[PDB]
Amino acid sequence: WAESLIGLHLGKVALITGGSAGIGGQIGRLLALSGARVMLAARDRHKLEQMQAMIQSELAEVGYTDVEDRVHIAPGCDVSSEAQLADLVERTLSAFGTVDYLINNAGIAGVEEMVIDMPVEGWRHTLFANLISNYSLMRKLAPLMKKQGSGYILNVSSYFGGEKDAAIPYPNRADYAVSKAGQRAMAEVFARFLGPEIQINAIAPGPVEFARRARLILENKRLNELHAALIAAARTDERSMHELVELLLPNDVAALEQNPAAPTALRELARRFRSEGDPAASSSSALLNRSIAAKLLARLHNGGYVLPADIFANLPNPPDPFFTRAQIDREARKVRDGIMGMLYLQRMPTEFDVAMATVYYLADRNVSGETFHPSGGLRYERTPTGGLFGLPSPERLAELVGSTVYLIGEHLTEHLNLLARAYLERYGARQVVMIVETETGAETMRRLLHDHVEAGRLMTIVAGDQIEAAIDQAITRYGRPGPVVCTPFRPLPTVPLVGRKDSDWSTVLSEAEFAELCEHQLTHHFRVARKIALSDGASLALVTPETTATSTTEQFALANFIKTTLHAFTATIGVESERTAQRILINQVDLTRRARAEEPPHERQQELERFIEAVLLVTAPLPPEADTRYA
Amino acid sequence: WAESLIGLHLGKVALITGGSAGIGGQIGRLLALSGARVMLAARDRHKLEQMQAMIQSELAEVGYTDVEDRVHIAPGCDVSSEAQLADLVERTLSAFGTVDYLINNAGIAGVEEMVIDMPVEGWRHTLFANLISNYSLMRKLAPLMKKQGSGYILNVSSYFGGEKDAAIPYPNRADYAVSKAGQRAMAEVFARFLGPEIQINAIAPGPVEFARRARLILENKRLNELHAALIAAARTDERSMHELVELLLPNDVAALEQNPAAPTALRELARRFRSEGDPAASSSSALLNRSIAAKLLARLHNGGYVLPADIFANLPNPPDPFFTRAQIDREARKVRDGIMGMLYLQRMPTEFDVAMATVYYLADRNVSGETFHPSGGLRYERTPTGGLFGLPSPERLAELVGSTVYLIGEHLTEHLNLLARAYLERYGARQVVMIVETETGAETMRRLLHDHVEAGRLMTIVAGDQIEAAIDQAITRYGRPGPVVCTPFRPLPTVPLVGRKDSDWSTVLSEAEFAELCEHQLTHHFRVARKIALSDGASLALVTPETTATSTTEQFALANFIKTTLHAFTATIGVESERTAQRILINQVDLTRRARAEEPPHERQQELERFIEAVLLVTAPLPPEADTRYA
């Protein structure tokens, strides 16, 4: 079966991260059979050694000699560590000389939580492991590729990283989805710079070849239903969140339902628990357990709600089982049937087959900037990214009277000034809280908005790199937001994206600068979305970098990289929020365009008004339902 | 070099249309080397025989025996003819038994004109040759594939057929672009029905490996500039189009520029010809030649303008050269440099290389509904298809007072009623001309709109299958349109899209019914767009079929097929119109959605209002420029 492969990649040197198992192991195996010398990098030494021994044995079977020279390993390699990536490249070049194929295959599942349960450092770790590592190894290996005249970079992405002009939501997986989309976007925007010498493509396989995860889903559902009901009740109830949570302390579903003084949101939730609950499960008669309570308390504390850390210290523990085996097995079959039901071909691909298709694809010298699907044929949700638009309804705009608006930004002073004035002057917002990065940014906005500052309608807060603490200041001092608009603090850098063939690339976008780019243009939005969703914001517009007719070709590339990658975040958290009955509406407003000629004197003011209308379209709330006694 | 290939497809039977040359010939060649028995179909017998002889010789070289049994040909095969497709399938099954791989490769370039110069029968011929042929061969070969448990359909599409969620404009090639997009859309929507037994995918290669075409471009540019200026002048000049064309009869650029009584549009055009013209070319001193005049006369006659057929009979002939060799060679280099400048890899792929990548791809058993790019890495324009939107500006809506609106449809009576009322009652349109297919449709709309009928604001015309003649009736009797809205006359069919494994497929969507689908859901819109652009309509909304919660799964599939395929048309004619300085704004409004659960009692009226707003957004004209003496 290896006859088609032998010789296909003879004389190539390949580095495969995550090479000890899964798709990466099979790509390493089949590249070796096809004649390439391979360096397999992974964290676990023992698994790598077994893989290396298996491959070398198979090479000897089909006639290669000196097989120890053809398959090397790099154990203990954590691709999230920049120092270890340098060590890996040094080890590889010492073994084999120049690398022909960089197979960026390593990937961690990530935090596996909803955004509002996702620690910021956990999100960052996923980005370093799954996305920044890919840029870093390219940055270390592309100079030698370009010098020798040929090279190939393959980022092993995922179907759940989306496609060129559409985003794919991956609820409870926003960090993973963003890193996958970033892998594809890196190929899309770096191809023109890396050509003609170097090809760069992504592969995005679909599903490839349990009770514990199902129980977690049910525990998460209980958490979401409680959190949404408490957030909603605190919105329209005179009682504090502290007083509302005290209603849950008896941990008695029927008693809460029957409490005439409990808010309707909580009473109706208790009725649902009793009706939809399995009578053999204690979740049908108890509101929560200690694990759910602690996670709920963290959500509330992370949303700026004030309540004692020991409020659940005397919570009665429901007896096992909280969910029955029947409930858990039912959810597990639902998960499995959902995944199987995606497959047009009704059969799960193997890792071997996906690797074989990838190894054939690597022979194709005429593709760059593409995302190849070695398996696919999937019925799954899809959100085409952006377009023509208009203004929202007059009744939705009338809902902005008296609102509290947060605006976040620094560099886009003209946008921030106009947006503040539109909310305040056109739609009678009560106040605008302007959250900037630095004192210099604060003074700039205060001068641009001096009239509204002097009248108490424009407040400024300096966030620095502590945006969550700044939002807590806004919550405490000025009240929770309705609309929030989040723009990046920083402009895009202007450094080269590739080096000249005979240069040392010393001025090219560094590994650290790429990480800084992700921090200011992706993580910035995730932190705001996380905090604002937790803090009961009504709507949130995420704004991507601006490009103008004077932007450089590299800035256009990076803007489109950010636009594509952020659309995966926006799509995912949108579906997460909808499916969990959070009310917050999260949307993305793009300021950039792919080509320079598409940029706007008069067209400038027209472009700024279009931005204003797009933001109003996604931040103007719906009017409440009418009083049924009269209308 | 064939070592990787031998055995890869051993025992497969493949039918390749367009198999005598180009990519199809190389796919046939490499499939044969890989062990498949191949039937090569093409029109020219001699070229096919040479290809067959070359392949058989190569098979004998690498060790196959009885090579005449491995490579057959089907000469004189015109895939645009349904009868010849039946003959081809009978010939193939007689030779080889069941076909494993259908390689739908045949394709003609098509009409190679702008939509407004494109004969309707020429458009239809391209659809039959390039798109309907693909369905017809699938319909004849899929039953045997499903019966034996395996099969593969590959539609050889093009990069200029777009991608899953974005359209790619191909000006002067709308018929080709639509057929290419339809090939991809057929794979996308039929995959779920054809699985698990049958895979269906498309390939969309980019450019693969002149003075005459450049001269045609320059002649077309002269045509476009004259036509746009005449159309514009007739709009605001008291003189008839007949009288305006008489100003061109001296065929003297300088005299027209200097004529104080000539409309400013024509005087400024003549100045441009003199300034931008090569003084050694007679196009700098003569307005047109007899070839351009005849094509211009056809445009005007096809737009309902009245002027004698012999109006250019005494036109002075400009001496050669009309365009200089320098001008022609300059345009030729511009065309070439444009295509080369697309390639990220700065090198043109060969037909052999694209075929090799396709033959490797055919081994992948885990992909269906995909579009594989065997070459790619292209910097080219892209229009992401659809989304959130709003209402247009109040000043744009005020421009609708006194307008003449055409509405075209029959089945969507509720949409047509509401749209007519919105234009008439909300925005003070002067009149609405309702163009339906049948008398029964006319009486239905007349009853729904009886108040506006009785008041002279709603006129009805019955078009049958002669929509162009019906529009001429509207032009003559009621005046030229501003906004036009074009909806399909017919609903989508409800027949099965595949048959049961042991059935004869007698109820499955027939080849004729697929052609009828294209006529009513694609050609219908092309004919209207062509006629309305020629007739100086100000805007045109193309509306795709409606789906509701009661639509069948097959109707959802066909609606998305039409939506994807029509977006290629809309994108192409949009860019064509913009690049040639036509003022007409053409956009697409989609009524369907991919999934059934995404369909709307109350949500129904909300969905209809959204449709109204989308149509107003693309049909409300811009206000004119203000009088500079005062503002």
Side-chain angles (χ1 to χ4, degrees), chain A residues 1-387 389-624 626-631, chain B residues 1-387 389-624 626-631:
Chain A
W1 58 259
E3 293 302 302
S4 181
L5 287 79
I6 301 181
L8 190 59
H9 298 283
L10 187 65
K12 297 296 195 255
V13 171
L15 169 64
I16 302 103
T17 63
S20 65
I23 289 158
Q26 297 299 303
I27 288 169
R29 174 196 182 185
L30 298 180
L31 279 172
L33 283 165
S34 78
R37 298 185 296 163
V38 301
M39 173 69 74
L40 306 177
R43 280 178 62 84
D44 178 57
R45 170 184 284 281
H46 175 74
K47 191 124 298 182
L48 257 183
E49 289 172 345
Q50 298 173 136
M51 180 62 67
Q52 168 182 50
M54 181 279 301
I55 296 175
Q56 293 172 347
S57 172
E58 194 165 37
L59 296 184
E61 287 184 308
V62 304
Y64 292 93
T65 67
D66 302 313
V67 302
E68 64 280 353
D69 299 329
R70 307 191 74 83
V71 188
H72 285 216
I73 58 168
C77 178
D78 177 1
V79 296
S80 74
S81 163
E82 173 62 19
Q84 297 182 44
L85 293 179
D87 292 328
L88 171 61
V89 165
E90 168 181 2
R91 178 169 179 90
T92 304
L93 297 173
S94 293
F96 295 139
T98 296
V99 174
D100 295 294
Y101 298 167
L102 167 62
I103 311 295
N104 273 321
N105 170 78
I108 65 173
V111 177
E112 300 191 286
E113 302 283 349
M114 290 161 61
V115 171
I116 59 171
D117 296 313
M118 181 177 297
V120 177
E121 289 296 350
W123 158 281
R124 285 202 188 91
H125 181 66
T126 301
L127 291 202
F128 269 96
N130 287 7
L131 172 55
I132 297 167
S133 64
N134 286 210
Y135 181 82
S136 170
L137 285 173
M138 168 170 83
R139 174 67 172 78
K140 298 170 175 49
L141 293 175
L144 285 160
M145 293 175 175
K146 182 166 182 172
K147 191 79 159 66
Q148 75 175 0
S150 64
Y152 201 123
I153 298 160
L154 188 79
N155 295 344
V156 180
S157 182
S158 174
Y159 170 86
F160 300 97
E163 285 182 10
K164 197 161 193 292
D165 294 291
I168 289 184
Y170 207 6
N172 298 48
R173 304 291 304 273
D175 58 328
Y176 183 81
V178 166
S179 73
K180 296 299 115 180
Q183 286 177 298
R184 162 174 62 82
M186 185 188 310
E188 291 175 351
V189 311
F190 277 85
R192 57 188 179 102
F193 297 91
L194 288 165
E197 295 88 1
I198 298 169
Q199 299 171 259
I200 181 166
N201 296 293
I203 62 159
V208 181
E209 279 183 2
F210 271 158
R212 177 185 299 106
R213 296 222 234 181
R215 185 185 51 79
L216 288 178
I217 293 170
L218 298 178
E219 287 192 312
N220 185 251
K221 175 170 137 78
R222 180 51 63 95
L223 167 64
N224 289 329
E225 293 172 347
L226 284 163
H227 181 245
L230 285 163
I231 294 305
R235 214 178 290 131
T236 69
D237 198 288
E238 58 291 343
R239 279 168 288 203
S240 68
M241 178 64 76
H242 185 183
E243 299 177 45
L244 294 174
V245 167
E246 287 181 7
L247 297 166
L248 317 176
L249 288 190
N251 204 10
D252 183 331
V253 166
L256 179 63
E257 179 187 4
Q258 297 165 16
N259 184 353
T264 303
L266 292 182
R267 296 187 68 189
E268 281 175 357
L269 189 65
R271 189 188 211 268
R272 275 192 62 196
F273 292 168
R274 194 178 40 81
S275 306
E276 292 171 15
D278 188 325
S282 58
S283 53
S284 67
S285 57
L287 294 160
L288 69 185
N289 59 21
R290 294 218 172 179
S291 156
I292 295 168
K295 210 168 178 179
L296 173 64
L297 181 57
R299 281 193 184 185
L300 295 175
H301 274 156
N302 289 336
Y305 295 95
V306 178
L307 65 173
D310 66 351
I311 189 172
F312 292 124
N314 306 318
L315 185 76
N317 299 302
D320 293 327
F322 194 64
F323 295 110
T324 58
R325 184 162 298 103
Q327 286 176 305
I328 290 151
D329 294 349
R330 199 165 299 124
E331 181 63 33
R333 296 193 303 276
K334 182 176 173 189
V335 173
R336 178 202 64 193
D337 293 351
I339 297 170
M340 279 311 297
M342 281 187 296
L343 304 166
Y344 289 161
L345 297 169
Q346 303 182 13
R347 163 181 38 85
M348 191 75 67
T350 66
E351 296 171 334
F352 174 91
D353 289 326
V354 170
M356 183 71 69
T358 301
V359 164
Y360 286 144
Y361 181 67
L362 281 173
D364 184 337
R365 291 283 158 274
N366 290 317
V367 287
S368 194
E370 304 290 334
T371 296
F372 171 59
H373 300 271
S375 61
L378 296 175
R379 180 199 305 277
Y380 193 72
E381 190 176 359
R382 182 172 292 265
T383 305
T385 58
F389 65 87
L391 209 60
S393 71
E395 44 263 8
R396 282 179 60 200
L397 290 168
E399 291 289 280
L400 287 171
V401 173
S403 57
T404 296
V405 179
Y406 295 4
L407 304 182
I408 296 162
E410 176 135 322
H411 172 72
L412 300 173
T413 64
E414 191 168 9
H415 293 71
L416 292 167
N417 176 53
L418 290 186
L419 249 192
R421 295 183 172 282
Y423 283 116
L424 293 171
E425 303 169 9
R426 264 124 87 178
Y427 304 112
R430 178 179 66 95
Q431 59 178 157
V432 167
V433 183
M434 179 76 60
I435 298 166
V436 305
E437 182 190 1
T438 67
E439 182 72 28
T440 292
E443 182 67 7
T444 291
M445 295 315 304
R446 285 193 295 249
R447 292 192 64 88
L448 288 175
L449 291 155
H450 62 288
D451 51 339
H452 293 297
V453 170
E454 281 140 45
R457 286 182 297 262
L458 196 288
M459 327 302 304
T460 53
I461 279 162
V462 177
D465 64 359
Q466 299 189 40
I467 186 64
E468 296 90 354
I471 291 169
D472 280 333
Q473 285 290 323
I475 292 168
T476 295
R477 286 153 56 181
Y478 305 125
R480 292 180 182 284
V484 180
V485 181
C486 181
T487 76
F489 285 154
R490 305 292 187 89
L492 296 170
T494 57
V495 290
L497 294 183
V498 296
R500 296 177 63 261
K501 181 179 173 75
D502 291 322
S503 79
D504 62 3
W505 289 46
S506 61
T507 66
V508 175
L509 185 77
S510 71
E511 302 91 332
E513 292 167 333
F514 184 80
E516 293 168 45
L517 177 76
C518 292
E519 181 75 31
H520 296 305
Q521 307 296 338
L522 298 172
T523 300
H524 175 85
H525 294 293
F526 147 80
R527 293 169 65 186
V528 172
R530 167 180 177 278
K531 182 73 183 180
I532 294 302
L534 286 160
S535 309
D536 198 26
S539 60
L540 175 63
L542 305 176
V543 186
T544 54
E546 164 184 60
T547 55
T548 65
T550 188
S551 293
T552 67
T553 188
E554 289 85 10
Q555 289 178 305
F556 271 107
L558 298 179
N560 286 107
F561 168 83
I562 292 307
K563 175 171 140 192
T564 300
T565 303
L566 192 68
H567 268 301
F569 179 72
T570 300
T572 292
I573 196 173
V575 169
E576 243 176 47
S577 309
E578 181 268 323
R579 283 183 184 177
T580 56
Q582 306 177 49
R583 67 150 194 187
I584 183 171
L585 301 174
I586 304 173
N587 284 280
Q588 179 168 324
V589 173
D590 291 327
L591 296 181
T592 184
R593 201 35 103 168
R594 255 163 68 259
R596 168 178 299 101
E598 304 182 274
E599 305 293 341
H602 167 80
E603 305 101 302
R604 168 68 177 176
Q605 281 309 304
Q606 228 167 311
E607 180 188 43
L608 283 162
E609 183 56 37
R610 287 160 33 88
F611 164 75
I612 297 297
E613 297 179 354
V615 174
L616 292 167
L617 195 60
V618 300
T619 54
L622 287 159
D627 187 350
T628 72
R629 309 186 291 264
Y630 299 114
Chain B
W1 58 259
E3 293 302 302
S4 181
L5 287 79
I6 301 181
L8 190 59
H9 298 283
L10 187 65
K12 297 296 195 255
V13 171
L15 169 64
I16 302 103
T17 63
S20 65
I23 289 158
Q26 297 299 303
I27 288 169
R29 174 196 182 185
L30 298 180
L31 279 172
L33 283 165
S34 78
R37 298 185 296 163
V38 301
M39 173 69 74
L40 306 177
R43 280 178 62 84
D44 178 57
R45 170 184 284 281
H46 175 74
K47 191 124 298 182
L48 257 183
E49 289 172 345
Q50 298 173 136
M51 180 62 67
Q52 168 182 50
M54 181 279 301
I55 296 175
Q56 293 172 347
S57 172
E58 194 165 37
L59 296 184
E61 287 184 308
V62 304
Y64 292 93
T65 67
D66 302 313
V67 302
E68 64 280 353
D69 299 329
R70 307 191 74 83
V71 188
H72 285 216
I73 58 168
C77 178
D78 177 1
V79 296
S80 74
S81 163
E82 173 62 19
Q84 297 182 44
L85 293 179
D87 292 328
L88 171 61
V89 165
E90 168 181 2
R91 178 169 179 90
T92 304
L93 297 173
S94 293
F96 295 139
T98 296
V99 174
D100 295 294
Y101 298 167
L102 167 62
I103 311 295
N104 273 321
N105 170 78
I108 65 173
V111 177
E112 300 191 286
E113 302 283 349
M114 290 161 61
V115 171
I116 59 171
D117 296 313
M118 181 177 297
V120 177
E121 289 296 350
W123 158 281
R124 285 202 188 91
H125 181 66
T126 301
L127 291 202
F128 269 96
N130 287 7
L131 172 55
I132 297 167
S133 64
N134 286 210
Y135 181 82
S136 170
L137 285 173
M138 168 170 83
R139 174 67 172 78
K140 298 170 175 49
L141 293 175
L144 285 160
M145 293 175 175
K146 182 166 182 172
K147 191 79 159 66
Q148 75 175 0
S150 64
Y152 201 123
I153 298 160
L154 188 79
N155 295 344
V156 180
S157 182
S158 174
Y159 170 86
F160 300 97
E163 285 182 10
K164 197 161 193 292
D165 294 291
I168 289 184
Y170 207 6
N172 298 48
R173 304 291 304 273
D175 58 328
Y176 183 81
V178 166
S179 73
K180 296 299 115 180
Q183 286 177 298
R184 162 174 62 82
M186 185 188 310
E188 291 175 351
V189 311
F190 277 85
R192 57 188 179 102
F193 297 91
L194 288 165
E197 295 88 1
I198 298 169
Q199 299 171 259
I200 181 166
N201 296 293
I203 62 159
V208 181
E209 279 183 2
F210 271 158
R212 177 185 299 106
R213 296 222 234 181
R215 185 185 51 79
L216 288 178
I217 293 170
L218 298 178
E219 287 192 312
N220 185 251
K221 175 170 137 78
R222 180 51 63 95
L223 167 64
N224 289 329
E225 293 172 347
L226 284 163
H227 181 245
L230 285 163
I231 294 305
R235 214 178 290 131
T236 69
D237 198 288
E238 58 291 343
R239 279 168 288 203
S240 68
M241 178 64 76
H242 185 183
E243 299 177 45
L244 294 174
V245 167
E246 287 181 7
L247 297 166
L248 317 176
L249 288 190
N251 204 10
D252 183 331
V253 166
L256 179 63
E257 179 187 4
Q258 297 165 16
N259 184 353
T264 303
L266 292 182
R267 296 187 68 189
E268 281 175 357
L269 189 65
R271 189 188 211 268
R272 275 192 62 196
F273 292 168
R274 194 178 40 81
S275 306
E276 292 171 15
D278 188 325
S282 58
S283 53
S284 67
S285 57
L287 294 160
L288 69 185
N289 59 21
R290 294 218 172 179
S291 156
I292 295 168
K295 210 168 178 179
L296 173 64
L297 181 57
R299 281 193 184 185
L300 295 175
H301 274 156
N302 289 336
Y305 295 95
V306 178
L307 65 173
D310 66 351
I311 189 172
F312 292 124
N314 306 318
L315 185 76
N317 299 302
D320 293 327
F322 194 64
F323 295 110
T324 58
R325 184 162 298 103
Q327 286 176 305
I328 290 151
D329 294 349
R330 199 165 299 124
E331 181 63 33
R333 296 193 303 276
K334 182 176 173 189
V335 173
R336 178 202 64 193
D337 293 351
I339 297 170
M340 279 311 297
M342 281 187 296
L343 304 166
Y344 289 161
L345 297 169
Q346 303 182 13
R347 163 181 38 85
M348 191 75 67
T350 66
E351 296 171 334
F352 174 91
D353 289 326
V354 170
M356 183 71 69
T358 301
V359 164
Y360 286 144
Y361 181 67
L362 281 173
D364 184 337
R365 291 283 158 274
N366 290 317
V367 287
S368 194
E370 304 290 334
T371 296
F372 171 59
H373 300 271
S375 61
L378 296 175
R379 180 199 305 277
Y380 193 72
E381 190 176 359
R382 182 172 292 265
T383 305
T385 58
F389 65 87
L391 209 60
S393 71
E395 44 263 8
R396 282 179 60 200
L397 290 168
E399 291 289 280
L400 287 171
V401 173
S403 57
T404 296
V405 179
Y406 295 4
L407 304 182
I408 296 162
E410 176 135 322
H411 172 72
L412 300 173
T413 64
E414 191 168 9
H415 293 71
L416 292 167
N417 176 53
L418 290 186
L419 249 192
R421 295 183 172 282
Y423 283 116
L424 293 171
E425 303 169 9
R426 264 124 87 178
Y427 304 112
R430 178 179 66 95
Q431 59 178 157
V432 167
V433 183
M434 179 76 60
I435 298 166
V436 305
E437 182 190 1
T438 67
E439 182 72 28
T440 292
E443 182 67 7
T444 291
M445 295 315 304
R446 285 193 295 249
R447 292 192 64 88
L448 288 175
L449 291 155
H450 62 288
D451 51 339
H452 293 297
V453 170
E454 281 140 45
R457 286 182 297 262
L458 196 288
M459 327 302 304
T460 53
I461 279 162
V462 177
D465 64 359
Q466 299 189 40
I467 186 64
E468 296 90 354
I471 291 169
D472 280 333
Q473 285 290 323
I475 292 168
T476 295
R477 286 153 56 181
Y478 305 125
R480 292 180 182 284
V484 180
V485 181
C486 181
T487 76
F489 285 154
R490 305 292 187 89
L492 296 170
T494 57
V495 290
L497 294 183
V498 296
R500 296 177 63 261
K501 181 179 173 75
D502 291 322
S503 79
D504 62 3
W505 289 46
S506 61
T507 66
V508 175
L509 185 77
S510 71
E511 302 91 332
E513 292 167 333
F514 184 80
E516 293 168 45
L517 177 76
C518 292
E519 181 75 31
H520 296 305
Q521 307 296 338
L522 298 172
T523 300
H524 175 85
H525 294 293
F526 147 80
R527 293 169 65 186
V528 172
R530 167 180 177 278
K531 182 73 183 180
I532 294 302
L534 286 160
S535 309
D536 198 26
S539 60
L540 175 63
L542 305 176
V543 186
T544 54
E546 164 184 60
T547 55
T548 65
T550 188
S551 293
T552 67
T553 188
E554 289 85 10
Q555 289 178 305
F556 271 107
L558 298 179
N560 286 107
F561 168 83
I562 292 307
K563 175 171 140 192
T564 300
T565 303
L566 192 68
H567 268 301
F569 179 72
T570 300
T572 292
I573 196 173
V575 169
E576 243 176 47
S577 309
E578 181 268 323
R579 283 183 184 177
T580 56
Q582 306 177 49
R583 67 150 194 187
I584 183 171
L585 301 174
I586 304 173
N587 284 280
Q588 179 168 324
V589 173
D590 291 327
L591 296 181
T592 184
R593 201 35 103 168
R594 255 163 68 259
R596 168 178 299 101
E598 304 182 274
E599 305 293 341
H602 167 80
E603 305 101 302
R604 168 68 177 176
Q605 281 309 304
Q606 228 167 311
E607 180 188 43
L608 283 162
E609 183 56 37
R610 287 160 33 88
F611 164 75
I612 297 297
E613 297 179 354
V615 174
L616 292 167
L617 195 60
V618 300
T619 54
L622 287 159
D627 187 350
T628 72
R629 309 186 291 264
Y630 299 114

